[PDB]
């Protein structure tokens, strides 16, 4: 028997939950607003069913707003036209509402807009959307062709703004590498160590994280928000803390074990990775930076 | 090289009962939970069922079924009580599998909305149709909401099956209407046989009404 | 290496309105519609063919921007009444730079031995007369193909407070539908004659009218 010894790293601006109940299936902390973390939660109305990418991005945006809260109010007075997305005469989004509802798991304006206006035909098509790309579209306004899944190329030929986004266009421009706030990383083929190490650095550098994973089917995988991680004395992940849009609103932050499974893959489970509990393999990571180097200018 | 994969949500689907099954106490309505695109490598799918958060143990779970696309489909079927469904109770499928980080939950209940009572009217054949061998008996159902309805025909207590019913059409006042057509040999109609249009719907007393149609009152 | 595209432009190709094809006063048009046209590759080139022979009279609609940041791009070819009815094939060929090759769709009229609609007008139920508004019914059955137009009139004026069911497939492979005109009971009780008008290929002059009145 050895002493317990755990290093815990949490996202810039996020208070770790304090009360964690063990449930029949998961260990979880219920959602309490204004602790800096977010739980956009799907209702499964036919439109949001496969929109976990836009939800994970949504939660990352709602954080982003909290981090950049004073610079953002200043930007919206300086550029009042970026307080709304117009499609000619109709109003599609009010940036003021996004801010006043961001605490709502089921009825944030930001997810309503994603579900209803920006990406309503994705679930029918049985595809979803890459979080990074939702972010690059919402902040910088980079056009998002939902059939193209590669990361944003700043040097690309089509440099015009997406009419669905571009809110912070005048600071976070297009065409400049330095103003792209997003990253994406592949974790297939990589080690516990390698994966542990990248999650530690990204958290430590002050990014918000999303983690994708296998979802017990051959065709369509899941993505969630990765808010904090626990590492062992050897510096490998033992555990992570997540919100998940398929999980109903009463669950909130969930602890997942991390560890190598029977089949030699890094995997995550509400229960301990051992025996027959083979968990879901972890697949990649998405990253959002605050952009404060740029905001300061 | 990095490679993306599709990210979205579940391969788990939860289906309501057939509307007509919920409205006829002769029939048994079932809520159905379906898991698709299951790999041959994956482990067992387990189902747990809940009604207003209370576990129930009468679900019928098929073994997994190989498909032409070489995946497996697993289905579980829970029979429900007519009045529970109509009173708006919530049915919850929990899908457990070791390859999922945690179990997946879906919940379904009836959509609520202000019911409206069907008006049911039977309309005899046109005089002009009597030059044909078979004639058309019509049942107009209008004024009703929601659109889930069942219409059947009977004659002297015997079921009449040579009919077709139109889909519901949205009427100008936001209610629905449909017509049903029973085709009968002119001879049988002229015998003075009493035919009956039965309509099953939420907003009728006893969920049921019957209107008669006959040559001579 | 780029990931491969998970979709692209779709083409939907739509027949003329039944009534337009049956009245030489009207001009029937076949309409070719392209959705999921990207803003990176928004130009669509359209080429039209009739029984494989190219025709050059298409009209080019201006592109329509959509809330989902794609375009709906349309081309509209007017056709000849009797070409459509004699069963000629219209082919829209769509070129766009997102696709290495054109998409071709072809439309023609449904095939099958045409069949004459039987039209029958059915008065309101005696039971319905307790209401302020009553229901006039037109049953149209026995007809093929399903392309048909149904209207209502009275005393020289069009009546527009009606709803018509979509065609439904009958057991013999023909089609049937009902149309419901709603009128204030007072109008019916006065003895006014309302008229159900049907346009279809298998009627003489492509038209018939059946009358309905209290008496
Ligand atoms: C981005 O947005 C645009 C805009 O969409 C609109 O706004 C968004 C927010 C949503 O709310 C949309 O629902 C809304 O429409 C999206 O563009 C849409 O893309 C879809 C496909 O993804 C198209 O669906 C097709 O629609 C046709 C029917 O189209 C008519 O009816 C619609 C309403 O019922 C109407 O909205 C359309 O404008 C169109 O209206 C007709 O227009 C013509 C020309 O002007 C006119 O003459 C007509 O009178 C008029 N009709 C009416 C009723 O007004 C439908 O037929 C298609 O179904 C076939 O293909 C399917 C494959 O997607 C398949 O599953 C079906 O089973 C069916 O298959 C066919 O079946 C027949 C037998 O029945 C067979 O013979 C055929 O061979 C077979 N073909 C195939 C290919 O399988 C299909 O549902 C929408 O038309 C289109 N909307 C518009 C406005 O153009 C775009 O998708 C969005 N993109 C993203 C990324 O989200
Ligand atoms: C591998 O093969 C699997 C098997 O599919 C069947 O067999 C193959 C060989 C083919 O012949 C198929 O065409 C055939 O269906 C596939 O499973 C299917 O997965 C898809 C999704 O990937 C499912 O589509 C969904 O359909 C829902 C409606 O479901 C009814 O209608 C279906 C057809 O449209 C039908 O197949 C269903 O069984 C069901 O219909 C009833 O079936 C019974 C018999 O059980 C009949 O007696 C009844 O008369 C039928 N009708 C009724 C009312 O009772 C949709 O609701 C659903 O959309 C919803 O979710 C999406 C998001 O997820 C939202 O966007 C949307 O708004 C809505 O909320 C969806 O379209 C399909 O149902 C599955 N089939 C079966 C049998 O379950 C695999 O997908 C395939 N794998 C791959 C990788 O290709
Ligand atoms: Na959630």
Numbering used by the authors:
A (entry chain C): 43 to 338, 349
B (entry chain A): 229 to 445
C (entry chain B): 230 to 444
Give verbatim excerpts from the published study on this entry.
The Streptococcus pyogenes bacterium secretes the protease IdeS and the glycosidase EndoS, which specifically catalyse cleavage and deglycosylation of human IgG, respectively. We present crystal structures of both enzymes in complex with their IgG1 Fc substrate, which was achieved using Fc engineering to disfavour preferential Fc crystallisation. We show that mutation of IgG Fc residue E382, which consistently forms salt bridge interactions in Fc crystal structures, can be used as a strategy to discourage Fc self-crystallisation and thus promote crystallisation of protein complexes. We present crystal structures of IdeS/IgG1 and EndoS/IgG1 complexes, to a resolution of 2.34 Å and 3.45 Å, respectively, and map the extensive interfaces that are formed in these complexes.
IdeS from Streptococcus pyogenes (strain MGAS15252), containing a C94A mutation to abolish catalytic activity, was combined in a 1:1 molar ratio with our panel of IgG1 Fc variants, and the resulting complexes were purified by size exclusion chromatography. We obtained crystals of IdeS in complex with the FcE382A variant, which crystallised in space group C121. The enzyme appears to clamp down over the lower hinge region of one Fc chain, creating a cavity in which the catalytic residues are brought into close proximity with the cleavage site. The carbonyl oxygen of G236 is hydrogen bonded to the amide nitrogen of the catalytic cysteine (mutated to alanine here) and the side chain of K84, which collectively form the oxyanion hole, as predicted. Binding of the hinge distorts the Fc peptide backbone at G236 in order to promote scissile bond cleavage; this residue is thus identified in Molprobity49 as a Ramachandran outlier. Unsurprisingly, the most extensive interface is formed with the Fc chain being cleaved (annotated as chain A in our structure), with an interface area of 1392 Å2 and a solvation free energy gain upon interface formation of −16.2 kcal/mol, as calculated by PDBePISA35. A secondary interface is formed across the second Fc chain (annotated as chain B in our structure), with an interface area of 804.7 Å2 and a solvation free energy gain of −7.6 kcal/mol.
